[PDB]
Structure formats: C-alpha cells, structure tokens
Amino acid sequence: MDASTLGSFTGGQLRRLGSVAGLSRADVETYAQVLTDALGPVAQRPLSLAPPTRTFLSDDHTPVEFSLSFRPGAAPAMRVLVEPGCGATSLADNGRAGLEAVRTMARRWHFTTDALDELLDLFLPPAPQGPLALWCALELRPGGVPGVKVYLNPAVGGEERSAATVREALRRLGHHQAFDSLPQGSGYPFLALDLGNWTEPRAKVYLRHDNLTAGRAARLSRTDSGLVPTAVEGFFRTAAGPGSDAGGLDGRPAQSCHSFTDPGAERPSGFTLYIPVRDYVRHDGEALARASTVLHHHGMDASVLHRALAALTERRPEDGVGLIAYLALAGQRDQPPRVTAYLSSEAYTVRPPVVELVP
C-alpha cells in the first residue's frame, strides 16, 4: 500500500515487541501514538530517503532504539529510546524540539520537570557540541502512563568541560559532591534524569571505559549499589567473548551508569555495566546465545528475547550483526539484579536490490 516511513516501521516494531513483552492491544496502541508524536515531523519520512541527521542514537542513524529488561519473577520491561529533535537543521534546534517533546509529555501525564529545569542552562546552551542534545526513553508500563527518562550531554561545551558539568548538575540536584564518589573513566557520555510524579530527582551519571578489563569492571561499583564483583566479572566474560582476557575490550568503549536516588546522598544506590556485544560477535545468533547464558545465570528464561529479535525483523539472527547492540547487568541496592538487551531498529539496514548477473 503506502511506502514505509520511520513512523510506520518503528511503530510496527514497537507494536510487535510490546506484544512479545505482554502489553495489551490498548497499551500498545497508546505507546505507538506516543512514539509517532515523539518523532514529530520525521515520523512521516520515507525510509527510501537518507537518514535525516547522522543521529548517534544507533549505528545506522535510526533515531529509535528498543530495550527489554529482565528481572527474576517479573514480566519483561520494555523501553523505547527516541531523539525527538531528529531532523532539526541544527543541534540547538534539535535540543529545543527535544525539550518541547518532553514538555508535551509532561502536560499529558503531569510528571514534575523541576529537576530537568534546574539543568537546562548547563545542557542546552547556544552552539552546543555533539553527539546529542536530548534523548528521551519511555518505559512502556501497563496502564498506558509511561516512565520518562531524559538523556543530556555533559560534553555539550566540549569534553574538557564534561567533569565540571556533571559535578555542577549533581550539586544542583541536591547530591552535594557526589561527583567525587564516581570511579575513574575516559569520559561522561550522558547525564540522565528519571521523571515522574516525584520532585526528588533520580540522577544517573554515565561513564565511558576504554579498554575495560574484567578486574577493572569488578571495581567500578561497591556492594551497596546492587552487584557483587564476581557477578560483574562473570557478566563481563560472558558478554565480551573474544574481547575478554586480551588487554581490555578492544571494540567501542563499555559504559557504566551510577544512580543517585536517596535525597542529599553523596554515594550511588545503583550501578549498571553496559557491554557493546555487537562489536564482539560474528552475528546476532552468538549475541543471543551470550544473552541467554547471562539470563540463565541470573535465574531468568530467555525465550522472550528470541521472540523479541523475530519481532524486530524477519532476518535470521545468524545472517547479520547489531540487532543486539548492548547487553547490561543492572544492580540496585536491596533488589535482585536486572539483565537488559538493547535492540537495534535497523530502519536503514536493508538487503540490497536483487538483480542477478547473467553472462
């Protein structure tokens, strides 16, 4: 019928993945509409056109990514990550469009944005530097009222100003000198806020880790942020396969996230390690096999993740790479660890046209 658009294609993925995650037809319809509205003008962009901006949200510049988070005894939790300002003619207008999208969501669900407002001069200046201005992740909760997380760029004024930007953000969010509790890293790729019916900020600091080793990974967190060193080393080795025991992971950098949630607290209560598994496998069959091992090690079934990949695309996992972009092990104080698979939309990753060569 009609040519596929970013909206129709990513919407189809949201619907099929949402059903795999056990969401109702009603909730899936609600969230498909939320994603279309979040994409704004680019939702109508035909997939036959080049990607609208070189968004760094995914390798092929699709401005949508999905995730499924597995907790023992819990239904799978689905998120969608979007860049609402995708297709703006400048990073400044990208940020403004991103902020408008978050405020529209706030007027709909009436979550508090005071914590975001406290940060906007730091993260949305004029002449911003890449690679992002504002991304939004929506947790697709039963009942149609999502969790909203906003991702901002500590390097917006240059990498040299990243550390000072994170320290000032945490101070403004009532976390004093929490910056000094963070482990050594190579960079600060994101600061994120979890927004809801709370005014108490939930602040997340991301660190880049170049050439990470299993031992160094074991030292990024303390017991009181939900993971134990042996679980972190086991996960590192399972996820990384050949990147393991070779002088440090040798593909794109690993990341950690440090969650500050207790009011006034100078120490994080949550820790996540992200491994870019797509750089360390022959194909998505191997990524799926490693994800299945991690899930089994944390007491969870993996059949939903097998259905999730088929929901994304009809492609055999073994016939490409990148459908599973990252795997993560997520700890929170006094909670069972969570395993998360980040799933690529691949809206711009197409089989070339079939035209047989006949001599």
Coordinates of C-alpha atoms in Angstrom, one line a residue, residues 27 29-35 37-38 80 101-113 136-141 143-149 195-198:
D27 CA -1.4 -0.1 25.8
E29 CA -1.9 1.4 20.6
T30 CA -1.3 4.2 23.3
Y31 CA 2.5 3.8 23.1
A32 CA 2.6 3.6 19.2
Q33 CA 0.8 7.0 19.2
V34 CA 3.3 8.3 21.9
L35 CA 6.3 7.3 19.7
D37 CA 4.2 12.1 18.4
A38 CA 7.7 12.0 19.9
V80 CA 11.9 2.9 23.6
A101 CA 8.5 16.9 23.2
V102 CA 9.3 16.3 26.9
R103 CA 7.1 19.3 28.0
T104 CA 4.3 17.9 25.8
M105 CA 4.6 14.5 27.6
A106 CA 4.6 16.4 31.0
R107 CA 1.4 18.3 30.1
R108 CA -0.2 14.9 29.2
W109 CA 0.9 12.8 32.3
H110 CA 1.7 15.8 34.7
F111 CA 5.1 14.4 35.9
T112 CA 7.3 17.0 37.5
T113 CA 10.0 18.7 35.3
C136 CA 14.0 10.5 25.8
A137 CA 13.5 6.9 27.0
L138 CA 9.9 5.8 27.6
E139 CA 9.3 2.8 29.9
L140 CA 6.2 1.2 28.3
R141 CA 4.4 0.4 31.6
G143 CA -1.8 1.2 32.1
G144 CA -0.5 3.5 29.3
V145 CA 1.3 6.0 31.7
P146 CA 5.0 5.5 30.9
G147 CA 8.1 6.2 32.9
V148 CA 10.0 9.1 31.3
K149 CA 13.9 9.4 31.4
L195 CA 11.0 12.0 35.6
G196 CA 7.6 11.0 37.3
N197 CA 5.2 12.1 40.0
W198 CA 8.2 12.7 42.4

